[PDB]
Amino acid sequence: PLRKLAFADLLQATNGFHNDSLIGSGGFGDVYKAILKDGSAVAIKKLIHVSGQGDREFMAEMETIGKIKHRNLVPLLGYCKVGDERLLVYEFMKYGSLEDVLHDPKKAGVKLNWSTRRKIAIGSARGLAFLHHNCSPHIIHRDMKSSNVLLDENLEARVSDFGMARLMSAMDTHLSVSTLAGTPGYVPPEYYQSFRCSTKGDVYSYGVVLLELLTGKRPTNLVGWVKQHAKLRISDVFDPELMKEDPALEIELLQHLKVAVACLDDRAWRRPTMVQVMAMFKEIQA
Numbered sequence: 001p002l003r004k005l006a007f008a009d010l011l012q013a014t015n016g017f018h019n020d021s022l023i024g025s026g027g028f029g030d031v032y033k034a035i036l037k038d039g040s041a042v043a044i045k046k047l048i049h050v051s052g053q054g055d056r057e058f059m060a061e062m063e064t065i066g067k068i069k070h071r072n073l074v075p076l077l078g079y080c081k082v083g084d085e086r087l088l089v090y091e092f093m094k095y096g097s098l099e100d101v102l103h104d105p106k107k108a109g110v111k112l113n114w115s116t117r118r119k120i121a122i123g124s125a126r127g128l129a130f131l132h133h134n135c136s137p138h139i140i141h142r143d144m145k146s147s148n149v150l151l152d153e154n155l156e157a158r159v160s161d162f163g164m165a166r167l168m169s170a171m172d173t174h175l176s177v178s179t180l181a182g183t184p185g186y187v188p189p190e191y192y193q194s195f196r197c198s199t200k201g202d203v204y205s206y207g208v209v210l211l212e213l214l215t216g217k218r219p220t221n222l223v224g225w226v227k228q229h230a231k232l233r234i235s236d237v238f239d240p241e242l243m244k245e246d247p248a249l250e251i252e253l254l255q256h257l258k259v260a261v262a263c264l265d266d267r268a269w270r271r272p273t274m275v276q277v278m279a280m281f282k283e284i285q286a
């Protein structure tokens with residue numbers, strides 16, 4: 001069960017929030033790696049801007065990822081809400097974010113061959129499909145991107161960062177919101193025109209991620225550049241390290257590219273659902 005963690009425990013597990021335990025900061029707050037007094041390896045997120053943008057994000061995760069468990073979603077282990085302080089505690093994912101691995105620090109890190117990236121794309125997709133289909137009310141993530149796909153010890157994908165997620169009734173096609181949420185290079189185009197979000201928006205953003213697995217490049221655009229070279233020579237867009245592995249899987253890559261293109265359609269009604277995406281990934285291996 002989700003644990004209510006005392007603020008002092010988190011203070012001491014991070015050595016008084018010392019810089020040496022900091023592994024990320026900006027916008028939302030801070031993220032620290034720590035070992036809890038019971039031995040648990042965890043990531044502890046310290047939210048800033050409480051009683052406003054910070055407290056809304058806190059409740060967003062509590063009402064979504066804090067209420068569900070799934071093999072392809074980051075497990076939220078605990079929380080701490082003491083006055084002005086807002087903290088959330090997650091199981092520590094060994095290999096960090098997909099963005100860090102994909103754009104390796106000093107060109108060094110874990111090498112991801114196609115078999116592993118394909119596993120990452122299927123796991124990521126199953127995570128979102130659970131949010132869109134199996135959860136009632138459905139969950140719209142609203143900020144899917146490669147920094148929000150974490151990789152555990154087995155290089156399995158686990159979707160993270162529900163600070164902007166929202167609940168939508170199953171008897172609704174969209175959710176009208178107050179603000180525009182998302183990251184440059186991942187926003188669905190219809191989010192710029194309407195204060196509305198949907199599972200088809202998550203599908204768009206998932207498409208960008210699958211493109212990062214296929215091309216190896218950052219979204220900042222990348223979506224349009226692939227769409228332009230898709231009508232020319234689609235052999236000049238995939239990650240060069242994937243073609244070194246085997247040029248015989250270029251046919252398999254193109255089929256995954258078609259899945260990505262369908263997710264990235266400017267029309268939300270034409271995008272697949274994540275359940276269709278999963279089924280499509282399965283037909284490629286059959």
Ligand SMILES: Nc1ncnc2c1ncn2[C@@H]1O[C@H](COP(=O)(O)OP(=O)(O)OP(=O)(O)O)[C@@H](O)[C@H]1O
Nearest residue numbers: 023024031043074090091092093096097147148161
């Ligand atoms: N459970 C976890 N296990 C291991 N590392 C984590 C975990 N959660 C977060 N991190 C690391 O902390 C950093 C911040 O994570 P978070 O998702 O809160 O930032 P973000 O909003 O995605 O940042 P940005 O999108 O600006 O890169 C990430 O780079 C990630 O690698």
